[PDB]
């Protein structure tokens, strides 16, 4: 079928990117593995195991 995980958007308030970690509120939820990362930051964040 497809091994592509679907990401979602989230922005609480006091949350920080789990990749570059900076002043902002950007987060993405990856299923199959369950991870959090900037709106994208794919260049920094690793590959969804
Ligand atoms: Zn980031
Ligand atoms: Zn995943």
From Swiss-Prot:
<feature type="binding site">
    <location>
        <position position="5"/>
    </location>
    <ligand>
        <name>Zn(2+) 1</name>
    </ligand>
</feature>
<feature type="binding site">
    <location>
        <position position="41"/>
    </location>
    <ligand>
        <name>Zn(2+) 2</name>
    </ligand>
</feature>
<comment type="function">
    <text>Part of a multiprotein signaling complex which promotes phosphorylation of Raf family members and activation of downstream MAP kinases. Independently of its kinase activity, acts as MAP2K1/MEK1 and MAP2K2/MEK2-dependent allosteric activator of BRAF; upon binding to MAP2K1/MEK1 or MAP2K2/MEK2, dimerizes with BRAF and promotes BRAF-mediated phosphorylation of MAP2K1/MEK1 and/or MAP2K2/MEK2. Promotes activation of MAPK1 and/or MAPK3, both in response to EGF and to cAMP. Its kinase activity is unsure.</text>
</comment>
<feature type="binding site">
    <location>
        <position position="48"/>
    </location>
    <ligand>
        <name>Zn(2+) 1</name>
    </ligand>
</feature>
<feature type="zinc finger region" description="Phorbol-ester/DAG-type">
    <location>
        <begin position="4"/>
        <end position="48"/>
    </location>
</feature>
<feature type="binding site">
    <location>
        <position position="38"/>
    </location>
    <ligand>
        <name>Zn(2+) 2</name>
    </ligand>
</feature>
<protein>
    <recommendedName>
        <fullName>Kinase suppressor of Ras 1</fullName>
    </recommendedName>
</protein>
<feature type="modified residue" description="Phosphoserine">
    <location>
        <position position="8"/>
    </location>
</feature>
<comment type="subunit">
    <text>Homodimer. Heterodimerizes (via N-terminus) with BRAF (via N-terminus) in a MAP2K1/MEK1 or MAP2K2/MEK2-dependent manner. Interacts with MAP2K1/MEK1 and MAP2K2/MEK2. Binding to MAP2K1/MEK1 releases the intramolecular inhibitory interaction between KSR1 N-terminus and kinase domains which is required for the subsequent RSK1 dimerization with BRAF. Identified in a complex with AKAP13, MAP2K1 and BRAF. Interacts with AKAP13 and BRAF. Interacts with RAF and MAPK/ERK, in a Ras-dependent manner. Interacts with 14-3-3 proteins including YWHAB. Interacts with HSP90AA1/HSP90, YWHAE/14-3-3 and CDC37.</text>
</comment>
<feature type="binding site">
    <location>
        <position position="30"/>
    </location>
    <ligand>
        <name>Zn(2+) 1</name>
    </ligand>
</feature>
<comment type="similarity">
    <text>Belongs to the protein kinase superfamily. TKL Ser/Thr protein kinase family.</text>
</comment>
<feature type="binding site">
    <location>
        <position position="20"/>
    </location>
    <ligand>
        <name>Zn(2+) 2</name>
    </ligand>
</feature>
<feature type="binding site">
    <location>
        <position position="17"/>
    </location>
    <ligand>
        <name>Zn(2+) 2</name>
    </ligand>
</feature>
<feature type="binding site">
    <location>
        <position position="33"/>
    </location>
    <ligand>
        <name>Zn(2+) 1</name>
    </ligand>
</feature>
């Amino acid at each position: 079928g497809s091994v592509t995980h679907r990401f979602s958007t989230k922005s609480w308030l006091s949350q920080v990117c789990n990749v570059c970690q900076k002043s902002m509120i950007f987060g993405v939820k990856c299923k199959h593995c369950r991870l959090k990362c900037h709106n994208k930051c794919t260049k920094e964040a690793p590959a969804c195991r």
